[PDB]
Amino acid sequence: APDTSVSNKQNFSTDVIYQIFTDRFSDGNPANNPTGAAFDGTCTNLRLYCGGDWQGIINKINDGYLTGMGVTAIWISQPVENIYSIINYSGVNNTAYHGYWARDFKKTNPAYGTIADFQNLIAAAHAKNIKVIIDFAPNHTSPASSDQPSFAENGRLYDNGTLLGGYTNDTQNLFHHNGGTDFSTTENGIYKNLYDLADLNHNNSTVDVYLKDAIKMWLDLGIDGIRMDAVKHMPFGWQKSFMAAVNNYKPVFTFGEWFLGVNEVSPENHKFANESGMSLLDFRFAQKVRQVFRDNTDNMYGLKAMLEGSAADYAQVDDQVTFIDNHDMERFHASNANRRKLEQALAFTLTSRGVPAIYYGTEQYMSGGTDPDNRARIPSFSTSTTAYQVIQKLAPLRKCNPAIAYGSTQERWINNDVLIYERKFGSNVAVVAVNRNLNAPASISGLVTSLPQGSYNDVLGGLLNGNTLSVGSGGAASNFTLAAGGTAVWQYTAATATPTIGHVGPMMAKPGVTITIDGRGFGSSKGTVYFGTTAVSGADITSWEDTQIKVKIPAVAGGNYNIKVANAAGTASNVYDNFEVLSGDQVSVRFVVNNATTALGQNVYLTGSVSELGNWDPAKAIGPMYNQVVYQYPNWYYDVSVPAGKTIEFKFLKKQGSTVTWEGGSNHTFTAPSSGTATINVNWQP
Ligand SMILES: OC[C@H]1O[C@H](O[C@H]2[C@H](O)[C@@H](O)[C@@H](O[C@H]3[C@H](O)[C@@H](O)[C@@H](O[C@H]4[C@H](O)[C@@H](O)[C@@H](O)O[C@@H]4CO)O[C@@H]3CO)O[C@@H]2CO)[C@H](O)[C@@H](O)[C@@H]1O
Ligand SMILES: OC[C@H]1O[C@H](O[C@H]2[C@H](O)[C@@H](O)[C@@H](O)O[C@@H]2CO)[C@H](O)[C@@H](O)[C@@H]1O
Ligand SMILES: OC[C@H]1O[C@H](O[C@H]2[C@H](O)[C@@H](O)[C@@H](O)O[C@@H]2CO)[C@H](O)[C@@H](O)[C@@H]1O
Ligand SMILES: OC[C@H]1O[C@H](O[C@H]2[C@H](O)[C@@H](O)[C@@H](O)O[C@@H]2CO)[C@H](O)[C@@H](O)[C@@H]1O
Ligand SMILES: [Ca+2]
Ligand SMILES: [Ca+2]
């Protein structure tokens, strides 16, 4: 299939995701609605169930509401079984309508549907070229009080009906009993409870094995992607081992939630996106878009900075999922604001790099503050809104114009209020002009583009007061006036002659797994694929076509490789970097080093004999290790993903800047378990 087919579960760059709060979308089957005090059919009480389900979604997929918009993927609430208790939070009754209070990860939430309904959802979707993404929240179960076991369901965890354990009298230690996080540090927010949510302990083999088993059930049910909830709140090493479980079984596009505040830029966030095997929800993008188009607390130079910065910070910026709002923020549209603000932000998001996600109801101009006012029932299924039409004109471009799906971004004209940028990939170009000033038009002179000489009609057809562009020689555009609140899109597409890799996925796996390389100019006859210097051709290349190649990862030593392809004629493509070849299946092991005293600003790291440990390269050591919660300084600890069953030699180091100090003595050694987890406790050797 081509890179753009619904069958492509490794790439979402050419798709537009529509985020649905199942309960608040459409009740297609009233028979499964909750009753009593846990239900409100009028959906006036937004913390109770309103009845939306999978049938409803199927109904909107079939009646053309979603397809009419140009939406090609839907991201739904966590489908697993949630607790049934109504929880009174100081007078207010609260239900698990949101789906984040899991009780059993191997069963469905009956309010949404049966496994049968779920299989039907996947089939209907797939039938209409819509990919299905599920929310998955393995950080915790539900709200529990260890001393008030009668509270809620005491955060009880079941394994397909079988009670695994509860928060109270947790002798197995499936959970964390470290108190609640104050979000003070990253380590603090990981090993302590999120509010009152029973924090699962991924270092317990039972929990480890159970979650990796549950995800496979869902993978086996045909999902096309996974949105991981609260990634900033689970150990990174564990998550990497979790992503290795998915990729080494049935790879699917995974992206996690790592909340970033306004003007917040986290290096931990960058490292996570670049090394965990999964990408992230682009909070940097979202916060900046709101400041610029919504709250006017920054201008075009700020948007530009974010664009060029992110592109440098994220190794695969095209895999970051963009949005302008979600269920954890006020809705972008404020009741009294000019709608043109939402429209422009939509046009910008849809044509920008990454994977755009649209929160259900946006196209209907829904307003609302924080939870739960931002989760009201969709008031209508009208296709007559300007927002609906903007999405409808622009969504398809991600499929037909690879410049938009994979292209680089470049500012071509800019001022406080105006931003003109160009996306380019191969022989494809797209230029977008946005004028946020709702009162002042702008005189655009000196605009230079990569567009071939000719005239260009605004792809939006003047919907947002865009205009025609006239490009003379040198791609220099003639002067024109950009209307107040003006937005226009111009483009040029043509066949690409040389092999151009636009995307690879999964980004991390062990040898033998098949990866998908998407792009243009591959030709129709099998060429060669290179992993570093190793050439692969013939049978291991399972499929080859102009826009897509499927190939098995050769049995090469674990490590980081550049990927390049050369067509049948021997013409080489661009280089795609940062592909990680695992040493084998992975397991999460906790490393602990005692009495490793440091000086302030000096941290302890770990390195070892395998690529998962950096191969003795301090520049690639794992850390810095933690020393607050689970163990306290001068004892350090860290959860790391290592190849299962391998005997590994390791050592710790103290690093300050790029200045490193090695542990004395001989390498410590240990053999990783074949499954489940383990804890290695050693003393720092001077
Ligand atoms: O009582 C249970 C509640 O749980 C549910 O909240 C969810 C969110 O909907 C998820 O999308 C996600 O979001 C968390 C996020 O993981 C977490 O970081 C936190 O964000 C902090 C952030 O760390 C901090 O840096 C600072 O910026 O403040 C942020 C808060 O704005 O909060 C997000 C939202 O809670 O995970 C949580 C838990 O899975 C549910 O939505 C609630 O209705 C429910 O009451
Ligand atoms: O002509 C090439 C030149 O175009 C753009 O410069 C704009 C500038 O952004 C506007 O603010 C205003 O000053 O008009 C200029 C056009 O002459 C690009 O920003 C710039 O990089 C580029 O060299
Ligand atoms: O909590 C992380 C913290 O650990 C190290 O700080 C040590 C410091 O080295 C010791 O001399 C002593 O004062 O205790 C601290 C632990 O609380 C790192 O030096 C520091 O950068 C790091 O943030
Ligand atoms: O460079 C590979 C090499 O790294 C480690 O050796 C350290 C050694 O442990 C230190 O005490 C110090 O001498 O620096 C060496 C790095 O040059 C590993 O211990 C070793 O097995 C490995 O080959
Ligand atoms: Ca229902
Ligand atoms: Ca946690």
CA dist 436 → 176, 254, 418, 523 (Å): 48, 33, 6, 42
**Cα angle: 93, vertex 99, 101; to 5 degrees:** 70
**Rg for the chain, CA atoms, rounded:** 26
Report the sign of the C-alpha dihedral through residues 152, 157, 161, 164, in that order. negative
Q: Which amino acids bring their CB within 6 angstroms of ligand 2?
A: 412-415, 446, 448
Ligand nearest to the CA of 656: 3
Q: What is the CATH number of the domain that holds 680?
A: 2.60.40.10
Owning domain of residue 506? 496-582
676 HSE (CA, 13 A, CB side): 6
Q: E strand or H helix at 104, and its extent?
A: strand 102-108
Contact 332, 358 (CB under 8 A): no
User: 60 CB under 6 A from ligand 1?
Assistant: no
Alpha carbon of 260 to ligand 4 centroid (Å):
39
Q: Is 574 found in the same domain as 620?
A: no
Q: Is 392 found in the same domain as 407?
A: no
Residue nearest to atom 6 of ligand 3 (CA): 600
User: 633 CB under 6 A from ligand 3?
Assistant: yes
User: 667 CB under 6 A from ligand 4?
Assistant: yes
User: 627 CB under 6 A from ligand 3?
Assistant: yes
The residue behind tokens 């170009």 is 429
Q: Is 455 found in the same domain as 475?
A: yes
PDB resolution in Å = 2.4
Q: Is 659 found in the same domain as 554?
A: no
Alpha carbon of 611 to ligand 4 centroid (Å):
15
User: 257 CB under 6 A from ligand 1?
Assistant: yes
Q: Is 62 found in the same domain as 7?
A: yes
Q: Is 501 found in the same domain as 409?
A: no
Residue nearest to atom 3 of ligand 4 (CA): 616
Q: Which one of 537, 553, 582 terminates a domain? A: 582
Query: Closest ligand 4 atom, CA of 663?
Result: 11
Mutate to test the pocket of ligand 3, among 600, 628, 655, 684 (most ligand atoms within 8 A of CB): 600
Q: Is 191 found in the same domain as 49?
A: yes
Which residues touch 686 (CB under 8 Å, ≥6 apart)? 663, 664, 665
Contact 9, 251 (CB under 8 A): yes
Selection from 450, 454, 428, 442 nearest residue 487 by Cα: 442
Q: Is 152 found in the same domain as 33?
A: yes
Contact 306, 263 (CB under 8 A): no
Q: Is 374 found in the same domain as 273?
A: yes
User: Which DSSP string corresponds to 264-328?
Assistant: ---HHHHHHHHHSS-EEB-HHHHHHHIIIIIS-SS-HHHHHHHHHHHHHH-TTGGGSEE-S--TT
Q: Is 87 found in the same domain as 65?
A: yes
b/e 189-227 (16+ beta carbons within 10 angstroms → b): bbbbbbebbbbbbbbbebbbebbbebbeebbebbbbbbb
Q: Which one of 373, 400, 427 terminates a domain? A: 400
Q: E strand or H helix at 68, and its extent?
A: helix 65-69
Contact 554, 536 (CB under 8 A): yes
Alpha carbon of 40 to ligand 6 centroid (Å):
32
In the numeric block, which tokens belong to residue 155? Answer: 């955060």
CA distance 562 to 558: 13
CA distance 121 to 134: 12
| Strands 73-76 and 131-136, sheet pairing | parallel
Residue nearest to atom 15 of ligand 3 (CA): 600
Contact 487, 500 (CB under 8 A): no
Q: Which of 153, 224, 257, 319 is catalytic?
A: 257
Q: Is 459 found in the same domain as 344?
A: no
- Residues, CB within 5 angstroms of ligand 5 (ion): 27, 29, 32-33, 51, 53
Q: How was this structure determined?
A: X-ray
Known catalytic membership, residue 268: no
Query: Closest ligand 3 atom, CA of 599?
Result: 9
Alpha carbon of 371 to ligand 1 centroid (Å):
10
Give me the residues paired with residue 264 across strands. none
Amino acid at 98: H
Q: Which of 117, 170, 229, 343 is catalytic?
A: 229
Which residues touch 658 (CB under 8 Å, ≥6 apart)? 619
Contact 650, 667 (CB under 8 A): yes
Residue nearest to atom 7 of ligand 3 (CA): 600
CA dist 549 → 8, 247, 452, 544 (Å): 11, 17, 30, 4
Q: Which residue numbers belong to the known binding site?
A: 27, 29, 32-33, 51, 53, 100-101, 139-140, 145-147, 190, 193-196, 199, 227, 232-233, 315, 327, 371, 375, 577
Ligand nearest to the CA of 417: 2
CA distance 592 to 670: 13
Amino acid at 305: A
Q: What is the CATH number of the domain that holds 52?
A: 3.20.20.80
**What's the domain count of the chain?**
4
Known catalytic membership, residue 229: yes
Give me the residues paired with residue 163 across strands. 158
Q: Which one of 529, 564, 582 terminates a domain? A: 582
Q: Is 427 found in the same domain as 570?
A: no
Which residues touch 260 (CB under 8 Å, ≥6 apart)? 266, 269, 283, 284, 287
Query: Closest ligand 3 atom, CA of 603?
Result: 18
Phi then psi for residue 604, to 5 deg, are -95, 140
Q: Which residue numbers belong to the known binding site for Ca(2+)?
A: 27, 29, 32-33, 51, 53, 139, 190, 199, 233, 315, 577
Residue 370: count other Cβ atoms within 10 Å of its Cβ: 12
Q: What is the CATH number of the domain that holds 471?
A: 2.60.40.1180
